[PDB]
């Protein structure tokens, strides 16, 4: 947790269904955006920050919150934007000997800035004598090591926590969710939408042949009247229904 | 890195823009229709920046403004790749674009340029010391008398750089060709400088003879045809002289005897001249600053 | 997927002298890394695991500083007996892995 | 404990070796790890393969030792090492790595076993 | 400690609803089944002035 990791998301499509075979028993309570809504949105900067705490140190990271890891591990911005991720991990992260290995800053001068880290190991001096590199009294290792103990309760038992840090500019998007599709079907009035592109008509074959990054086709009357189907590279005439006034 | 010493100084060669300059401005199809667009458009007959490359050695580093159109009268490729950036360091993240012998290397990092960067069969590359915070990087297929000539369109706008290529067999002859889009890239830094990068054959070491050619996109209005089958064929300039204005205020490329009225005339002012009164009304700033004697 | 390297691959000290030898990879490997020094003709053994913590009947001398990418082994004190090659192996992911253990590092006392 | 190697000859290039590692005084339990390495006659250590002792055997391979090496356990205290097409820079020195945490690959090493050497010549 | 407030609730309320529901809120997966244990809370919170 004081050494977190910090991983780069970008020019990919985000899923959020397989987060539950990888990461059972997750809590997905978060803050600045609807968690149901997540798979239709689109991000342009994506963080990803991952350790491991123990389960009474879960809900310190939370956006305002003071505790022993917030202040001196990883300090949560008051405007943070993004969701966090938790789940047990007492199937992987207890052993028999100890799980000895994941250590957290104890002892540190001030409290640490939002999205800071701290690997420093110097011998904290908590008296008026320096330490001079000796670790006695009034002198403590700033970092210790968590002692998970699984035979407690889940507060003492070894935590997984991934924070994932968006923007939602939804303009400049690099990151972005499916949307699926649907099959073709033709020569029929029909409720068309490419890529946002909402409208009513008849889809038919199209003789055009324009260019490959050409995408769409306008007329005349400066509405998009051809379209290229994203799913398979075909050209089709967008025409509306036959309609006319009745005497 | 090597240092070049060997450069011969001398002004730029200059040229006429002619008619080159005109790219597909959108992906949407019209066919057999003219279309009026306000885009950053080459101007016509514009004079642009000549480099003769052979002992000519012309890798100057140019501002970048709100665009650039490359051309280049090439011959066994001696053009490789180009930089682009601002500050040409490790200091702010660069852009480096080569078309080595397999393939073209699109990488945005925090690079240290050499001084001399240039390219010498080919197997030494010498453009760069250092590469610090890579972004994004791209691998993609290759982009390639004299017999050919490339003509390129950089832009940056929103973040995105838009890059427009023409490949074409014949100084800058007549004719017309539009540019289609090439490649997008949604990097998002801003760029104010760049260099081109060349090969240099290694015998000390020669350079063949071939030329490129530097032009500055504007904010102008043209009038496209598009033909019938969907491809822009002739282009008019609405700003050029007055005869083109008409046309394209008539929104035709022909125009019928008589007289027509285009725009407005008028004289732009060019000074400012505040009138106030003489203010004399000094506040007694005097007696509550420089009192010998201040109140408890 | 993780390179590491070990420099220098030479130091010398005089005996009362302090060298230090640090250990980079090439991304962030935390808190997971552990120093070996094996004297010749013999297996090496465990200094400095999860690069902290000190192992068991070493002198206090064998230490370590840095995490993350970079990880620093400072040695106080020599007593021309500590005369070895140090490694350092990443413990982090080994996936696909062509060497966990770091580059050589040999220890040279001018006694 | 010790883990004295086993296996180790002279050998023709493009060949195959047997090397047995040993474990003496406790078996191989599910959780701690074992693993391989090697040490060359001239350079450092290095990283070629190795196996969990663990009910479902969580094998993992270096990357410039992908196919031609082969490590299965035999016994609850006996493990070998199989490689094949021999070459003349596969010559080193061979150890018994013995870990100390079952995170699917080679933790922290607490324990080795003497080695054996295995060396090619023509 | 007299005035309660609710905290967990499957969706949101419709305009002019009222829940006076007080079954467990199953946060989890394993069902509460009455028990008040983790990621199994009381969806009714009281006001601490
Ligand atoms: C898109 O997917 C469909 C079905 O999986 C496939 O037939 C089609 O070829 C794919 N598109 C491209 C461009 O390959
Ligand atoms: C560029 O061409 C123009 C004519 O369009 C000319 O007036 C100008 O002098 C030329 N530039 C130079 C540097 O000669
Ligand atoms: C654009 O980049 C330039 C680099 O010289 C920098 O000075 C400027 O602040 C940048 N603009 C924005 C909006 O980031
Ligand atoms: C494209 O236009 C040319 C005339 O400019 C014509 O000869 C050709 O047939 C057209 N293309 C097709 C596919 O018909």
Same mark, same amino acid.
Request: aromatic letters at 14%.
């Given at each position: 947790?004081?050494?977190?990791?910090?991983?780069?998301?970008?020019?990919?499509?985000?899923?959020?269904?397989?987060?539950?075979?990888?990461?059972?028993?997750?809590?997905?309570?978060?803050?600045?955006?609807?968690?149901?809504?997540?798979?239709?949105?689109?991000?342009?900067?994506?963080?990803?920050?991952?350790?491991?705490?123990?389960?009474?140190?879960?809900?310190?990271?939370?956006?305002?919150?003071?505790?022993?890891?917030?202040?001196?591990?990883?300090?949560?911005?008051?405007?943070?934007?993004?969701?966090?991720?938790?789940?047990?991990?007492?199937?992987?992260?207890?052993?028999?000997?100890?799980?000895?290995?994941?250590?957290?800053?104890?002892?540190?001068?001030?409290?640490?800035?939002?999205?800071?880290?701290?690997?420093?190991?110097?011998?904290?001096?908590?008296?008026?004598?320096?330490?001079?590199?000796?670790?006695?009294?009034?002198?403590?290792?700033?970092?210790?090591?968590?002692?998970?103990?699984?035979?407690?309760?889940?507060?003492?038992?070894?935590?997984?926590?991934?924070?994932?840090?968006?923007?939602?500019?939804?303009?400049?998007?690099?990151?972005?969710?499916?949307?699926?599709?649907?099959?073709?079907?033709?020569?029929?009035?029909?409720?068309?939408?490419?890529?946002?592109?909402?409208?009513?008509?008849?889809?038919?074959?199209?003789?055009?042949?324009?260019?490959?990054?050409?995408?769409?086709?306008?007329?005349?009357?400066?509405?998009?009247?051809?379209?290229?189907?994203?799913?398979?590279?075909?050209?089709?005439?967008?025409?509306?229904?036959?309609?006319?006034?009745?005497? | 890195?090597?240092?070049?010493?060997?450069?011969?100084?001398?002004?730029?060669?200059?040229?006429?823009?002619?008619?080159?300059?005109?790219?597909?401005?959108?992906?949407?199809?019209?066919?057999?229709?003219?279309?009026?667009?306000?885009?950053?458009?080459?101007?016509?007959?514009?004079?642009?920046?000549?480099?003769?490359?052979?002992?000519?050695?012309?890798?100057?580093?140019?501002?970048?403004?709100?665009?650039?159109?490359?051309?280049?009268?090439?011959?066994?490729?001696?053009?490789?790749?180009?930089?682009?950036?601002?500050?040409?360091?490790?200091?702010?993240?660069?852009?480096?674009?080569?078309?080595?012998?397999?393939?073209?290397?699109? %990488?945005?990092?925090?690079?240290? !340029?050499?001084?001399?960067?240039?390219?010498?069969?080919? @197997?030494? +590359? &010498? =453009?760069?010391?250092?590469?610090?915070?890579?972004?994004?990087?791209?691998?993609?297929?290759?982009?390639?008398?004299?017999?050919?000539?490339?003509?390129?369109?950089?832009?940056?706008?929103?973040?995105?750089?838009?890059?427009?290529?023409?490949?074409?067999?014949?100084?800058?002859?007549?004719?017309?060709?539009?540019?289609?889009?090439?490649?997008?890239?949604?990097?998002?830094?801003?760029?104010?400088?760049?260099?081109?990068?060349?090969?240099?054959?290694?015998?000390?070491?020669?350079?063949?003879?071939?030329?490129?050619?530097?032009?500055?996109?504007?904010?102008?209005?043209?009038?496209?045809?598009?033909?019938?089958?969907?491809?822009?064929?002739?282009?008019?300039?609405?700003?050029?002289?007055?005869?083109?204005?008409? %046309?394209?205020?008539?929104?035709? !490329?022909?125009?019928?005897?008589?007289?027509?009225?285009? @725009?407005? +005339? &008028? =004289?732009?002012?060019?000074?400012?001249?505040?009138?106030?009164?003489?203010?004399?009304?000094?506040?007694?700033?005097?007696?509550?600053?420089?009192?010998?004697?201040?109140?408890? | 997927?993780?390179?590491?390297?070990?420099?220098?691959?030479?130091?010398?000290?005089?005996?009362?002298?302090?060298?230090?030898?640090?250990?980079?990879?090439?991304?962030?490997?935390?808190?997971?890394?552990?120093?070996?020094?094996?004297?010749?003709?013999?297996?090496?053994?465990?200094?400095?695991?999860?690069?902290?913590?000190?192992?068991?009947?070493?002198?206090?001398?064998?230490?370590?500083?840095?995490?993350?990418?970079?990880?620093?082994?400072?040695?106080?004190?020599?007593?021309?007996?500590?005369?070895?090659?140090?490694?350092?192996?990443?413990?982090?992911?080994?996936?696909?892995?062509?060497?966990?253990?770091?580059?050589?590092?040999?220890?040279?006392?001018?006694? | 404990?010790?883990?004295?190697?086993?296996?180790?000859?002279?050998?023709?290039?493009?060949?195959?070796?047997?090397?047995?590692?040993?474990?003496?005084?406790?078996?191989?339990?599910?959780?701690?790890?074992?693993?391989?390495?090697?040490?060359?006659?001239?350079?450092?250590?290095?990283?070629?393969?190795?196996?969990?002792?663990?009910?479902?055997?969580?094998?993992?391979?270096?990357?410039?030792?992908?196919?031609?090496?082969?490590?299965?356990?035999?016994?609850?205290?006996?493990?070998?090492?199989?490689?094949?097409?021999?070459?003349?820079?596969?010559?080193?020195?061979?150890?018994?790595?013995?870990?100390?945490?079952?995170?699917?690959?080679?933790?922290?090493?607490?324990?080795?076993?003497?080695?054996?050497?295995?060396?090619?010549?023509?």
């Amino acid at each position: 947790v004081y050494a977190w990791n910090r991983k780069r998301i970008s020019n990919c499509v985000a899923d959020y269904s397989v987060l539950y075979n990888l990461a059972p028993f997750f809590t997905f309570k978060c803050y600045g955006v609807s968690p149901t809504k997540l798979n239709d949105l689109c991000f342009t900067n994506v963080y990803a920050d991952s350790f491991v705490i123990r389960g009474d140190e879960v809900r310190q990271i939370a956006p305002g919150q003071t505790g022993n890891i917030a202040d001196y591990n990883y300090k949560l911005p008051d405007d943070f934007t993004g969701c966090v991720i938790a789940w047990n991990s007492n199937k992987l992260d207890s052993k028999v000997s100890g799980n000895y290995n994941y250590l957290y800053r104890l002892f540190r001068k001030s409290n640490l800035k939002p999205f800071e880290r701290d690997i420093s190991t110097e011998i904290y001096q908590a008296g008026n004598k320096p330490c001079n590199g000796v670790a006695g009294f009034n002198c403590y290792f700033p970092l210790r090591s968590y002692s998970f103990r699984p035979t407690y309760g889940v507060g003492h038992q070894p935590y997984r926590v991934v924070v994932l840090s968006f923007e939602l500019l939804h303009a400049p998007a690099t990151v972005c969710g499916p949307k699926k599709s649907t099959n073709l079907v033709k020569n029929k009035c029909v409720n068309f939408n490419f890529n946002g592109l909402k409208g009513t008509g008849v889809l038919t074959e199209s003789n055009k042949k324009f260019l490959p990054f050409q995408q769409f086709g306008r007329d005349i009357a400066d509405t998009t009247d051809a379209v290229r189907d994203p799913q398979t590279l075909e050209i089709l005439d967008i025409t509306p229904c036959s309609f006319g006034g009745v005497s | 890195c090597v240092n070049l010493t060997t450069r011969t100084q001398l002004p730029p060669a200059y040229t006429n823009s002619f008619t080159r300059g005109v790219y597909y401005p959108d992906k949407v199809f019209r066919s057999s229709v003219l279309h009026s667009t306000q885009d950053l458009f080459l101007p016509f007959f514009s004079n642009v920046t000549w480099f003769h490359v052979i002992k000519r050695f012309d890798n100057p580093v140019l501002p970048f403004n709100d665009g650039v159109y490359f051309a280049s009268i090439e011959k066994s490729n001696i053009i490789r790749g180009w930089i682009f950036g601002t500050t040409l360091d490790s200091k702010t993240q660069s852009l480096l674009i080569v078309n080595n012998a397999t393939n073209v290397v699109i %990488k945005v990092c925090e690079f240290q !340029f050499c001084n001399d960067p240039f390219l010498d069969m080919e @197997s030494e +590359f &010498r =453009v760069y010391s250092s590469a610090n915070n890579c972004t994004f990087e791209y691998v993609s297929q290759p982009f390639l008398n004299f017999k050919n000539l490339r003509e390129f369109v950089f832009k940056n706008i929103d973040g995105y750089f838009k890059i427009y290529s023409k490949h074409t067999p014949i100084d800058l002859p007549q004719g017309f060709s539009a540019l289609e889009p090439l490649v997008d890239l949604p990097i998002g830094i801003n760029i104010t400088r760049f260099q081109t990068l060349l090969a240099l054959h290694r015998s000390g070491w020669t350079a063949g003879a071939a030329a490129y050619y530097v032009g500055y996109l504007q904010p102008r209005t043209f009038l496209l045809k598009y033909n019938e089958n969907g491809t822009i064929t002739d282009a008019v300039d609405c700003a050029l002289d007055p005869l083109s204005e008409t %046309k394209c205020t008539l929104k035709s !490329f022909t125009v019928e005897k008589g007289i027509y009225q285009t @725009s407005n +005339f &008028r =004289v732009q002012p060019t000074e400012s001249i505040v009138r106030f009164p003489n203010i004399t009304n000094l506040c007694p700033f005097d007696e509550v600053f420089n009192a010998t004697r201040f109140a408890s | 997927d993780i390179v590491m390297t070990q420099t220098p691959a030479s130091v010398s000290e005089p005996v009362g002298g302090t060298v230090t030898i640090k250990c980079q990879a090439s991304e962030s490997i935390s808190n997971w890394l552990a120093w070996y020094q094996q004297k010749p003709g013999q297996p090496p053994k465990l200094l400095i695991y999860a690069a902290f913590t000190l192992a068991s009947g070493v002198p206090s001398r064998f230490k370590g500083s840095g995490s993350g990418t970079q990880f620093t082994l400072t040695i106080n004190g020599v007593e021309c007996a500590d005369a070895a090659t140090y490694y350092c192996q990443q413990t982090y992911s080994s996936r696909d892995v062509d060497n966990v253990f770091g580059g050589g590092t040999e220890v040279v006392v001018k006694g | 404990q010790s883990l004295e190697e086993s296996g180790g000859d002279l050998v023709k290039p493009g060949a195959s070796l047997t090397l047995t590692c040993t474990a003496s005084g406790f078996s191989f339990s599910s959780g701690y790890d074992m693993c391989w390495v090697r040490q060359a006659p001239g350079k450092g250590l290095e990283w070629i393969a190795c196996i969990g002792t663990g009910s479902s055997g969580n094998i993992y391979y270096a990357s410039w030792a992908k196919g031609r090496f082969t490590i299965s356990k035999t016994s609850s205290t006996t493990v070998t090492l199989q490689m094949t097409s021999l070459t003349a820079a596969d010559t080193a020195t061979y150890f018994c790595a013995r870990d100390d945490a079952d995170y699917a690959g080679p933790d922290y090493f607490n324990l080795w076993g003497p080695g054996t050497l295995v060396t090619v010549s023509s």
